[PDB]
Symmetry: D3
Subunit: 154 residues, 6 copies
């Protein structure tokens, strides 16, 4: 079902350090998207290496892993129709320098290696990333009071 589509959003160490946690949550919360999982974590290197498994072997991999463990991150799971595509459109382009005002990276970032937040690039990655960072017990399913005002009835 469309409305049960989920995406993994993660505030990176720079996002936490710069006090942007609330702001990242705000963009999703005000949109009518539903937060079904959340936690602050000081991830281990091994958990991040699997997350960035696609980048293993590249010259910047070590630097990326150490940087991503230089501070704690905030893991989130958002649910709602097309939340994967809308999610990353709300974050902006990968590069803050190509991101427009109104987006998170366009509003708050400059360097690509300090882009404060991560969003799953597809439904496939989202389902994978959700299972990597969270256990099914951490997913809190609920119904919004505003559901019928956010979504069109069948």
């Amino acid at each position: 079902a469309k409305q049960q589509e989920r995406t993994y959003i993660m505030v990176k160490p720079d996002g936490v350090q710069r006090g942007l946690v609330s702001e990242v949550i705000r963009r999703f919360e005000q949109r009518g998207y539903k937060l079904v999982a959340l936690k602050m974590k000081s991830p281990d290197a091994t958990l991040l290496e699997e997350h960035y498994a696609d980048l293993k072997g590249k010259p910047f991999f070590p630097g990326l892993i150490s940087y991503m463990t230089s501070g704690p991150v905030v893991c989130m799971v958002w649910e709602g129709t097309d939340v994967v595509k809308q999610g990353r459109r709300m974050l902006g382009e990968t590069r803050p320098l190509e991101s427009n005002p109104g987006t998170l990276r366009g509003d708050f970032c400059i360097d690509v290696g300090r882009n404060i937040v991560h969003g799953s690039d597809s439904v496939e990655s989202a389902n994978k990333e959700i299972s990597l960072w969270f256990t099914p017990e951490e997913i809190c399913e609920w119904t919004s009071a505003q559901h019928k005002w956010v979504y069109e009835q069948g």
Copy 2:
């Protein structure tokens, strides 16, 4: 004259229900556009049938009318140069999933059937829409104190 242009903006039932009336108003108010008519109303079906007259005969028509009578609406008239087109642009695309961050629909909506606000799509239709939801007596003309700083006549 350019500056006398007017458009009809209406916060739909979902916008009122989700506590978005002030935000819709903020977008136009901070832009320098001038509010000249405003009211909350729970319109009759007869009035809504005339508003969506061109949609009469469609299979979703009866349901639309029931949805637009399921909660009150806030009716508005804003005046200023190119307000019709700028208003639409500020609302976003008709579909929230194609609307950009920074727009009302891009920031707060997901489903097209719950896109929170309506804006006249053209000057011709604006004049029609205004004459329909408001009497001439409800229009309140005034001159903004910021007029010479928002507009440049020499």
Copy 3:
């Protein structure tokens, strides 16, 4: 009974002029109060003179009436528990210079004669102000979707 309580809130001409209509509405709308009536209006002198009846004859009365008709106002009826008192508290003190930061007048005003907004001072005067500024047909009754989350039963 308690939730049914209503108050009359009005953005004065200086409030409309200074672009503060959305900020006044927000204070109430984000608090969980329910907007049941709303309209922009250019009230005539007679209406305003009835509203400020007790002040007729004061040296500043004519000037007061001129000011209240120098631009449009935004009329509102908000509904909810203790909305009269909480409304007044949100607007701040009548004198902006005695209003705390966080209140509308504390955040946006200086002169008492330019205090952007009015709120009924009691349930009795709210009932009076509401029937003066609005007709019963302009009051739209509905049920907020967040009602069970704003109020305990």
Copy 4:
């Protein structure tokens, strides 16, 4: 020793339902308090019955537990000087009708039974709430880059 003080802040089910999670976090985040633990949870009746242990036997107790399990909550631990007392001051008074504008409850709540958020009332009370809601492994130790500018020195 003073800067290590911690408090437990919890967004209740009405807070999440009304979209106020980010706003609660903001008040603490912008103040300079360090977020050291955070999670969304759907606690079971046993955990809540322990949290509200003093209220057992009250006629409203069963209803209170069902309400507190009617939707998920967001649990938090903030760290910083005098954070327990300031945290309470930022939330407002337990009763929203006694909370001033600028505080969380004063800005967003009306009923004491739907007062959107909870804060530990004392150091000793926080330490107990923290260990009850969080394992020590969920507490993340870190140094803020703005430390020398928030604290002296």
Copy 5:
């Protein structure tokens, strides 16, 4: 003349460093107070020592001076009725731990030594501080288009 009362407001080094410049300005700009002088500066010890002349005898004074030269400050002169006392009110109490929510210090500070901003305590201090930090040529006198809406003409 009460409307022409001026006060000296300065964003301290922690304020600049924590990105709170726009927020301190917003509090006054928003209130209807008029910005008549503004500048970023890295004052030398002699100027600061004179600015804090009353605290000259205290044991912490030298440490206060070196802290005030550890980063730049944003100097401001605001104008309006009772601006000195209201300015102070808006900043909060000297001590952030005694400042209420809604005030600058109550919203953003914790330590009294990192209370992000300074405001003149009286008209006499204001006048002394203005002429110390600014020259009359830097004081830009102007009339606000909103004057007749912020103030009663009487």
Copy 6:
């Protein structure tokens, strides 16, 4: 170096009059760009004519000069990677009617002549403008505590 890049940003008289000074500063400040020079000034014709030299000879030139001496301006220098380009993008298109929501002009403006703000269009003109409006003694050198979180290690 990329990060050392600077651009001149100026709040025009309409921006000051409309109380948008804090908003213009916020866009850059929250982005992570660094404020290194700031001042309110009532520039004389000679300076304004030098700033707008490219437009000398145009029929509207005198009127432009009159308008720019109509009220005070706020002069700023912002430092950071690609700040000239990103600054312009954050301001919006020259014409407010062609500016997107989320940009300064798209959010607050209507007329091209009342577009509240100016930003240098290139590095070359940025260097010229900064020297014109500010002396080197007015530029404040400092290091931001969020630097390692705004910019990549190296």
